[PDB]
Amino acid sequence: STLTKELIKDAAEKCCTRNRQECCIEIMKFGTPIRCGYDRDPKLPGYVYKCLQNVLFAKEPKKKINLDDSVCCSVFGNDQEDSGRRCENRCKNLMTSPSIDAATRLDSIKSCSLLDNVLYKCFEKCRSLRKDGIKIEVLQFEEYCEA
């Protein structure tokens, strides 16, 4: 749709170390989270995610999603059923995959939570509160999602 070989290689070159170029290209083409041996500093994968999003979606900024919104995914597990945990994990993976645009992630998350609409609305509310300046980790969903 928007991802090209040129764009992915450029993002990898601008954001990943020389030895991790291939790995960065791989997680972008497969649409997965950044691993790549960024072990010494656990905060680095997060910064690489932001760098990659900024290069891949430079022309279409609305396709980006703040990395912090991935914490909102925990709400899907409140559906104490296997499908709830499955959607929660799917959400966490999607929300930490830098090359997957917003619409694609949200369509998949909305689809797995179709029989739990209340939880999807809470997920969206959590994202709005994060955008509004609330460090969401401070509040449990029960505090701003009353259902």
From Swiss-Prot:
Name this polypeptide is given: Protein her-1
Keyword entries, A-Z: Developmental protein, Glycoprotein, Secreted, Signal
Subcellular localization(s) per the UniProt record: Secreted
GO molecular function, one term: signaling receptor binding
Main location: secreted
Region of the whole protein represented: 19 to 164 of 175
Keyword Signal belongs to the record: yes
Cited function: Dictates male development. Probably plays a direct role in cell signaling during C.elegans sex determination. Inhibits the function of tra-2a.
Example of a GO cellular component annotation carried by this entry: extracellular region
Residues bearing attached sugar chains per UniProt: E81, E146
